[PDB]
Amino acid sequence: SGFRKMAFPSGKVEGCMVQVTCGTTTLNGLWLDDVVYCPRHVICTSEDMLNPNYEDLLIRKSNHNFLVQAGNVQLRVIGHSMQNCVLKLKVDTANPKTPKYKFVRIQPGQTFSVLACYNGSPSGVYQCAMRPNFTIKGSFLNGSCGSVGFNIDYDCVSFCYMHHMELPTGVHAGTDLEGNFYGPFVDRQTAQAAGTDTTITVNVLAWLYAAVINGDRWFLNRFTTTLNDFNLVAMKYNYEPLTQDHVDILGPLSAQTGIAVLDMCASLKELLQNGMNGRTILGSALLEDEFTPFDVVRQCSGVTFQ
Amino acid sequence: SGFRKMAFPSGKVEGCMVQVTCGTTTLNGLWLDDVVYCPRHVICTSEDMLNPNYEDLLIRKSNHNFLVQAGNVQLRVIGHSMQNCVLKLKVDTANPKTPKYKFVRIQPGQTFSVLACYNGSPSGVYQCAMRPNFTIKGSFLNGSCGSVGFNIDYDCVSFCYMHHMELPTGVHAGTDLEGNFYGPFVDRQTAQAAGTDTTITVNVLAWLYAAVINGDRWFLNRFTTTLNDFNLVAMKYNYEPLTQDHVDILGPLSAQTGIAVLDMCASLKELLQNGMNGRTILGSALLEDEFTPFDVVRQCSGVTFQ
Ligand SMILES: *[C@H](O)[C@H](C[C@@H]1CCNC1=O)NC(=O)[C@H](CC1CCCCC1)NC(=O)[C@@H](NC(=O)OCc1ccccc1)C(C)C
């Protein structure tokens, strides 16, 4: 038993990380087949970043201005193009380590693993949730741009996030692998509002089920509630409203524990209204919302990949 | 910026994971050069586990009784031996993916990444601390035995932990790669006491420095303290006593932030005596002790590996 925030094994993604340099700027790229993907702001100087005209900036660049290193194995750039906020560099060699892969645009509340990288070299791996306001709470320093987020389904890597910038609150923003930002953000160094974040209610409930499965369970109470009654409580505490779709997604955990979803909602409502009274659940003194149901099921069924 | 509990990239270790089967029991092994390492309890049946005579049980076994699969690539066993609580199977093929590696026995309070594995296939990766009572708080199900803990120093993997069992409190116990348990535990299915755990004070202080570096810093107070005065507080709250060696290890973080170590101890003393009053530090409502100083420095300097 035990429950930990767990990232996917990163080896398949490690073999795809390269370094991209344009002039003074170095960041990470993702090398799949004969294409390298990276943030288009690799082309910006420190004064372009305040209000860049990316079309005009890219026109000044030719293939030979993009330096791509894989380790110290190095790639010849034979074409370049901009797709939304990502630059796509065609290279003359297909990555021999390309895994089976897909590009996916994830939904708010879903989770993924981040392989944080500097100069094309992996530094660490951790699990993130895409917040309801389309930010992530990551760990990113200068040079981490182009680091990617991903999920694995057995042998297939689903890339879902590429890192671009940090907002004025320490939270992080980036794009899918077609270069479309999650949320309202633009790749300009200017003040940008993320807007109110909310707690991912279905994930909190999934984590309460994980706690029961692991014997942590003082919070189970006597009451039940209704989906409309609970949602009145969710509103006051900035929790996402719970829908029947969420109830259905929680079905397997409900069946495993024998605790009806609305009974668990009643326990959650009392935790929200009364706090935890200095106690903990699965080692946390806060209600955790970065585990999806489905993360919970895999962690307590032992799903593997390769 | 931002601070996350981050594991090492796992690819170098993924290429070393194999499946070991003896009779009815399947677990994970570690394949380095021409040797496969796994828990010796792979030889036990469900009624051996209550009081096993490992010498007598192993004598019944020959090389051909140990089935080792690498993926579905499969290895011929040409010798076997028991070293403390690990079994070492000599195979006829050296692992072509063997990284540069060392076996290390870590100290209590140090951290490492765990690659949780089932049937020789990686499932996930997370960071653990070896508690002062020589347990870890992991996430391990049936079949995870033989999963390993490790650190990376650029290109060298230091293996430090192999998982063996779960105690009567949900905490986990295992050995170094020479098969010596951390702590007082034996590989028998019998009630076993871990003894009182304590909080890793130098790690809490390192994490408070990480918080200041990230602008989280309401807890900085007006006071200072002495190492002897602070240790009186540490005693009452089951914190490890702070030594000058710990102060010296905190030197770089002290120099980076301009906060004297004993001033940070005074902030910690007030957090211990008064709690956090419903506030958070780096997203946690508890004092976190599973980051070493040195983890903090790498996370806020961007150290990479490959
Ligand atoms: C690429 O390695 C970095 C990664 C960030 C550095 C520290 N944490 C990070 O996640 N990205 C950048 O340095 C960004 C440069 C890009 C160039 C032009 C296109 C968009 C930005 N810049 C940032 O992340 C900066 N944040 C930012 O621009 O947010 C807008 C803002 C500015 C002022 C006040 C409010 C909001 C970051 C602060 C360095």
Ligand SMILES: *[C@H](O)[C@H](C[C@@H]1CCNC1=O)NC(=O)[C@H](CC1CCCCC1)NC(=O)[C@@H](NC(=O)OCc1ccccc1)C(C)C
């Ligand atoms: C190998 O895959 C598993 C991993 C554990 C299963 C669930 N969580 C785990 O970490 N290891 C085992 O199943 C252990 C078998 C070994 C065979 C004989 C040598 C030592 C054990 N068994 C356990 O981990 C069990 N725990 C245990 O034996 O602790 C001692 C104990 C027993 C009763 C009351 C107090 C303490 C576990 C409970 C299945």
